[PDB]
Design a protein around this ligand. Sequence first.
Ligand SMILES: [C]C1=C(Br)[C]=C([B]([O])=O)S1
Length: 113
Amino acid sequence: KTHVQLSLPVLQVRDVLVRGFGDSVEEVLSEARQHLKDGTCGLVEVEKGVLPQLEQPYVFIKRSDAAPHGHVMVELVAELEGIQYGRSGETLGVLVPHVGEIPVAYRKVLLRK
Ligand SMILES: [C]C1=C(Br)[C]=C([B]([O])=O)S1
């Protein structure tokens, strides 16, 4: 399948224990994809002051289409020092490792793998 239905635990930024996927654009997108597959990926909603509390490179899920079965279609875009690798629609938030933090919600997405 080119696309996978996922339910992502939405985390408060101050609860996040592991605040990034790694050290290069290529590593963060790789690790993001692995954690998404393994169901160990969380989502932090982007607001004023959220991003500076997280580690670069950032991995965003962005809306790729304008919602099969409730699941918003998204794709992965990385950002390092103001440069994005990928081009997509609006940010649904920033992906982070999930290591058992209690979420505040769940975000249903159809991910282009
Ligand atoms: C992002 C990816 C998800 Br979810 C599942 C993959 B697979 O085919 O093993 S790759």
